Design an enzyme around this catalytic site. Structure first.
Site, PDB file in Angstrom:
ATOM      1  N   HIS A 181      -2.190   2.099  -5.739  1.00  0.00           N
ATOM      2  CA  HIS A 181      -1.384   0.884  -5.788  1.00  0.00           C
ATOM      3  C   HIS A 181      -2.168  -0.321  -6.288  1.00  0.00           C
ATOM      4  CE1 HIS A 181       1.279   2.984  -2.672  1.00  0.00           C
ATOM      5  NE2 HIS A 181       2.030   2.810  -3.745  1.00  0.00           N
TER       6      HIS A 181
HETATM    7 ZN   LIG Z   1       2.254   6.517  -0.265  1.00  0.00          ZN
END
Ligand SMILES: [Zn+2]
Lengths: 199, 382, 70, 503
Positions: free
Chosen positions: B150
């Site tokens: 992320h």
């Molecule tokens: Zn995840």
């Protein structure tokens, strides 16, 4: 008497969103189903979501025409067979989040069924987001009660608000959002832009 | 074209028995994210203890990757962001509040002890796995300490500070012509996907729950931009997918792209939050369904690196990671838990298998058919 | 109807102090915060952040001078 | 009792200030209404502003006393925003990476899953505390063993800089503050940093004792944790098995059934969202194709009447025949028979107009029925699949109401038979008892008796007229309160279909 003037949001939208206003399209009010831009079929049965849909960041400061039927207004007004009204799904103060019920929002702005009250009413702010006309309520309401007149509602979508205070206006106690214990709202905000009464 | 295929028990492929280099460090399990935090590196220690007590060390060469330096991290990240990350401590955040609000650190990326050491060790694990996979010294690198996707070039979000996946991808690209990336995490690989939009060298496929979820990105129309057109496929799904549905929506896409893209190297994220009983997940997969993807990818005989992310209930992610590690060696597992330090945390039955939940699946077959229709239509262009 | 009523009011007003019709269900496992503000708690979750375990964080009750994580 | 006499005196002062007996009684009514959790605090203070607002001090006491873009999700960064220098980037990293496009953003868990998450979090918190205690014990042990060899002169001037030679200076602070109290933790840390010679041994001894105490406490709590996990984990698999259980618990309330029809009316037919077609006459459609699902349910009913605790034998003998009477009269199956231009000849469509009681009984009947009609299409399939069943489920449902079988085994019996196809047969006892209770309240009431007599008279006629229906409506309304919600039921013999409509 709780008063929130709230002119910061509109000026902020004006400076940072110089895009021309556009009418997205007509919206037909629903009582139990999420709203949509179509009219061919409005049925869904599976074994109360907010009526307003996701608009997105790219559609900030735009006008969405909303049509509200008279029977739903009746049913919501006296709290008879209305999940949103019994749940008090109202959030905001003259500027309301996307999850606030449109009928409760309009009631929170000063709208009232029947003839206007004969008392010493203050300057109504039924359309606070429309700075050009803060009381843009056109058309003549029926003098006789019970006459079904349809409401054409214009909503101006606004960016997210930092906090939604709880006030008791027009016998409505909206819920509170955006406090320190709560979290920043993710959906957009909207208010009553223009009102036209249709028979 | 989507067709219903019932799930079948997993059996290893004795055709290949490639070397497995399970990177691990004993200091990663010490770091903590908070008190009520769901993300815990303790699950890596749980999985390693399960592997150790299970008897799997005789086959795989266990390493200890050297922590990466700042200059290595600067291959993808910005100097300012990595400087702030190194300098920030759980004590002097008040003086660093400007960067904290600017670099989005504090809300979902809490500052804790040895945070820069955690990022450095994950980056070094991915870097050394890629280095081993590039020199020919190995063919599978189980870098369970990584799995941080992320994170972006100048931002840290979703408990993800340093994007080690793209660093390993760059290392592979040092001498490989084309590289390919896979995801199994319920969320979307925003940083890894974005890192290679305009170029053909890297492809980023993510099987991510879409709609009102954490990443909020990765629709079916994320075809690409510029010369990287049609080289970033996405397979958005819905809540409640099961093992057979996941297999049917996973295998044909991979087969088609490796027929077309023809990858020279492969990396596979192994997010453990897409299982039944997960805390931050919304799927219904089991360990068999989770291991199906890694077994399928390994069966194609290509240099692959397995990284480990996600996982917010200890037992599920630990058992899934142990099963994946075993199946990477072409060895079926005993499916009985030997006694270890964390024997009390493994359910009331103390069995390796975890029963998937009964919850209602939502993925309609026609929606999946249309989704893979668009996927194949856009992939056919190249 | 007077002494009992004042005793009951005093009890019910001191019970809330010093810490503690549809009742609505608790919201656990949602990452939207769009139309779920109605549910119990759910003021700490949002689409912006990943963590959603906050709603089921245990609460405390002060009994015999010490808290207890129920 | 310590904080009650003050409130008694305050209320006495308020009563004296009011001075009026009737106003005092009204204030008592207000506070009693608040005591029933019906009045909001803001409403309460606004109301007390009228009474005690004259006295500012008493009002204050009360107030303080009660509280360019490309792609759908990607936007091109401007030319000025593309310069974030990175020294580690080489030629390949420049050519093959992107720095001009950035992406932009555009289910209820079971209660037992939440309980398992809480248990796991508590276990991990205990484990983290124990591990931090172990690390701090090791650090203090190495410090003590290093200082013991050191001379007395260096001991006197020994100063401990922050960090304690640890990979994380904040690791031991939390453990110290946990072992001690929060107010003394900073003092203990400062004393350790300034007087290590006298502080390290005693703090190490405290840590050594607390490790044993915490381990014993964890092993004591593990009994309850094990029992909770053993008794809850098995239940924590059926997401549909419990959510539908609570839905069935909350569904069969008197308001809800009429709410369904009123909602569907006001949404589809009354509102006319299409605004193109006239509203349909009816609302819901039901079918009764099979008649063998009648004898078994009647046997279940007779079992409940023969097993019920609170029912008299003269009442039971009536109930044993009432059900046969309604089935024979409604479905035409097997005065003495009763006790046992609009004129259309040989009518096949019949109308039943009644109050909430008959409507609730009919809705209970249909809710029990559609649970059994769905398994009709899957009985043969599951019979095929089990060996790779109607009598079995019937006999398994027999033994619950009579008490032969406990409630628990019913849920797990159907699990292996139907993994996900059947999730509505788990609460048959509750709906059956609701139906029998509603039949009893149908028979007992005199107004319901008159309604059933009118229905009997209407059904006994094989030919109807336009005026006859109006006469029937007027007669049923004669003893009927106007405020009560009017419903109508029409049953079609031709298709064996029963329809309903909200008036
Ligand atoms: Zn995840």
């Amino acid at each position: 008497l709780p008063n929130v003037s709230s002119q910061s949001v509109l000026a902020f939208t004006e400076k940072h969103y110089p895009n021309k206003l556009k009418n997205l399209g007509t919206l037909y009010y629903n009582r139990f189903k999420e709203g949509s831009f179509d009219e061919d079929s409005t049925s869904y049965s599976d074994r109360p979501p907010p009526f307003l849909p996701a608009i997105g960041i790219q559609n900030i400061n735009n006008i969405a025409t909303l049509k509200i039927t008279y029977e739903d207004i009746q049913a919501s007004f006296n709290n008879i067979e209305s999940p949103r009204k019994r749940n008090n799904e109202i959030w905001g103060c003259d500027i309301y989040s996307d999850d606030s019920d449109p009928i409760l929002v309009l009631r929170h702005c000063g709208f009232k069924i029947g003839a206007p009250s004969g008392g010493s009413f203050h300057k109504l702010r039924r359309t606070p987001v429309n700075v050009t006309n803060q009381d843009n309520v056109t058309g003549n309401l029926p003098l006789l009660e019970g006459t079904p007149f349809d409401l054409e509602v214009e909503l101006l979508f606004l960016p997210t608000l930092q906090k939604y205070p709880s006030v008791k206006r027009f016998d409505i106690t909206s819920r509170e959002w955006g406090s320190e214990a709560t979290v920043i709202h993710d959906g957009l905000s909207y208010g009553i832009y223009s009102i036209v009464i249709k028979q | 074209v989507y067709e219903a295929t019932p799930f079948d028990p997993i059996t290893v492929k004795p055709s290949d028995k490639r070397r497995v280099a399970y990177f691990y460090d004993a200091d990663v399990g010490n770091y903590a994210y908070g008190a009520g935090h769901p993300m815990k590196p303790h699950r890596i220690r749980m999985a390693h203890s399960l592997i150790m007590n299970y008897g799997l060390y005789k086959k795989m060469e266990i390493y200890r990757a050297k922590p990466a330096t700042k200059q290595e991290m600067c291959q993808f990240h910005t100097d300012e962001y990595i400087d702030f990350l190194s300098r920030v401590t759980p004590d002097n955040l008040e003086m660093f509040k400007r960067e904290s609000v600017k670099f989005n650190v504090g809300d979902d990326c809490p500052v804790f002890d040895g945070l820069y050491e955690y990022c450095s060790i994950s980056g070094g694990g991915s870097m050394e796995g890629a280095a081993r996979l590039n020199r020919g010294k190995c063919d599978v690198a189980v870098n369970y300490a990584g799995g941080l996707h992320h994170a972006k070039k100048s931002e840290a979000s979703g408990f993800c500070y340093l994007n080690d996946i793209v660093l390993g991808i760059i290392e592979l690209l040092r001498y490989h012509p084309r590289v390919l990336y896979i995801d199994i995490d319920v969320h979307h690989g925003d940083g890894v996907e974005e890192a290679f939009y305009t170029t053909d060298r890297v492809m980023t496929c993510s099987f991510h729950k879409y709609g009102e979820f954490f990443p909020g990105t990765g629709e079916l129309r994320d075809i690409g931009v510029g010369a990287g057109k049609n080289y970033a496929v996405n397979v958005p799904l819905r809540d409640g997918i099961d093992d057979a549905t996941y297999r049917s929506v996973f295998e044909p896409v991979i087969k088609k792209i490796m027929e077309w893209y023809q990858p020279s190297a492969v990396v596979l994220q192994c997010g453990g939050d897409s299982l039944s009983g997960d805390r931050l997940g919304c799927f219904n997969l089991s360990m068999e369904g989770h291991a199906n993807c890694v077994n399928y990818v390994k069966s194609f005989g290509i240099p692959m690196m397995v990284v480990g992310g996600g996982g917010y209930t200890m037992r599920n992610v630990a058992r899934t990671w142990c099963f994946e590690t075993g199946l990477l060696n072409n060895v079926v597992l005993d499916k009985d838990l030997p006694y270890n330090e964390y024997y009390e945390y493994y359910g009331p039955d103390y069995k390796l298998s975890v029963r998937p939940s009964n919850m209602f699946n939502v993925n309609t077959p026609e929606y999946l058919d249309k989704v893979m229709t668009n996927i194949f239509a856009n992939l056919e262009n190249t | 109807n007077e002494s009992n009523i004042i005793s009951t009011f005093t009890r019910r007003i001191i019970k809330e102090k010093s810490g503690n019709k549809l009742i609505y269900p608790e919201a656990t496992g949602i990452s939207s915060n769009r139309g779920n503000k109605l549910l119990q708690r759910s003021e700490v979750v949002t689409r912006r952040d990943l963590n959603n375990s906050k709603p089921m964080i245990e609460q405390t009750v002060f009994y015999n001078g010490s808290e207890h994580r129920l | 009792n310590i904080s009650l006499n003050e409130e008694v005196t305050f209320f006495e002062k308020a009563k004296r200030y009011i001075g009026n007996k009737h106003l005092y009684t009204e204030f008592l009514k207000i506070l009693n209404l608040y005591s029933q959790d019906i009045l909001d605090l803001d409403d309460l203070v606004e109301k007390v502003d009228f009474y005690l607002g004259s006295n500012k001090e008493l009002f204050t006491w009360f107030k303080n006393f009660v509280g360019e873009a490309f792609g759908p999700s990607y936007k091109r960064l401007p030319k000025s925003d593309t310069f974030m220098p990175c020294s580690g980037r080489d030629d390949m990293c420049w050519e093959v990476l992107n720095d001009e496009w950035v992406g932009h953003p555009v289910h209820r868990k079971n209660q037992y899953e939440e309980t398992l998450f809480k248990i796991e979090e508590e276990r991990h918190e205990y484990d983290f505390y124990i591990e931090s205690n172990l690390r701090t014990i090791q650090c203090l042990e190495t410090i003590v063993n290093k200082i013991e060899n050191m001379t007395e002169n260096e001991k006197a001037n020994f100063k401990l800089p922050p960090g304690l030679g640890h990979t994380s200076m904040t690791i031991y602070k939390k453990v110290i503050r946990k072992v001690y109290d929060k107010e003394r933790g900073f003092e203990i840390i400062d004393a350790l940093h300034e007087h290590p010679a006298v502080t390290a041994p005693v703090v190490l001894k405290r840590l050594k004792q607390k490790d044993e105490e915490w381990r014993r406490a964890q092993r004591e709590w593990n009994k309850v944790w094990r029992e909770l996990e053993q008794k809850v984990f098995f239940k924590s698999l059926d997401h549909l098995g419990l959510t539908f259980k609570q839905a069935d618990k909350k569904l069969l309330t008197t308001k809800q059934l009429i709410s369904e029809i009123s909602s569907i009316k006001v949404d589809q037919t009354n509102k006319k969202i299409h605004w193109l077609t006239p509203k349909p006459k009816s609302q819901l459609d039901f079918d009764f194709p099979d008649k063998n699902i009648f004898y078994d349910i009647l046997c279940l009913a007779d079992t409940f009447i023969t097993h019920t605790t609170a029912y008299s034998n003269p009442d039971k003998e009536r109930l044993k025949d009432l059900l046969k009477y309604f089935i024979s009269l409604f479905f035409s199956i097997s005065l003495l028979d009763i006790l046992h231009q609009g004129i259309i000849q040989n009518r096949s469509i019949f109308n039943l107009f009644a109050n909430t009681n008959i409507y609730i009984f009919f809705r209970h009947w249909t809710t029990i029925y559609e649970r059994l009609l769905e398994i009709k299409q899957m009985n043969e399939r599951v019979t095929k699949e089990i060996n790779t069943a109607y009598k079995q489920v019937l006999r398994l449902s027999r033994r619950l109401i009579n008490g032969d079988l406990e409630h628990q085994w019913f849920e797990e019996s159907l699990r292996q038979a139907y993994n996900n196809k059947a999730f509505k047969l788990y609460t048959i006892d509750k709906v059956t008892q609701s139906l029998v209770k509603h039949a009893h309240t149908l028979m007992t009431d005199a107004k319901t008796a008159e309604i059933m007599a009118l229905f009997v008279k209407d059904r006994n006629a094989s030919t109807t007229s336009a005026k006859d229906q109006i006469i029937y409506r007027l007669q049923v309304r004669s003893h009927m309160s106007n405020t009560e919600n009017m419903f109508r039921i029409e049953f079609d013999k031709r298709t064996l279909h029963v329809s309903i409509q909200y008036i």
